[PDB]
Symmetry: C2
Subunit: 89 residues, 2 copies
């Protein structure tokens, strides 16, 4: 139901060292799982997106299989990360 | 002996989809080895640098162990990729 202001805020300015849970689609509980998986910061997760050549099917299985995110949560991270790259990459 | 103009050209404008061998420190022969390793484009190699949290010792072993680059060639890619991130990340 309408994206949060975080989506426009993230693709409106550099990401710097913001925490992983700052990425749109990742909640406080999910941010903790990615952190246990070695992604304590967003740019480390951005790297995984870059390693998958922006492949949406591979990206979705990675997040869901890695933490259990739902199909709705994965759609927000794909378009959210894909849009940041369009402005910064 | 003095860096090539490619170093200043790469950190002077976005990287887009330039080929891997376009990264400073990677020669035409080495670009072919990375390509056989699955890195047909520079942004895929940029992702590995991001996944290593910019760790220089881990990055150097990755390139040398992955293709056989010399210690001099690895120094150019670290500072070259590190400088691009400073301007675009």
């Amino acid at each position: 139901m309408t994206t949060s202001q975080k989506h426009r805020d993230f693709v409106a300015e550099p990401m710097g060292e913001k925490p992983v849970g700052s990425l749109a689609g990742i909640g406080e509980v999910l941010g903790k799982k990615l952190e246990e998986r070695g992604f304590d910061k967003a740019y480390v997760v951005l790297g995984q997106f870059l390693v998958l050549k922006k492949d949406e099917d591979l990206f979705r299985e990675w997040l869901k299989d890695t933490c259990g995110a739902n199909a709705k949560q994965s759609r927000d991270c794909f378009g959210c990360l894909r849009e940041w790259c369009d402005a910064f990459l």
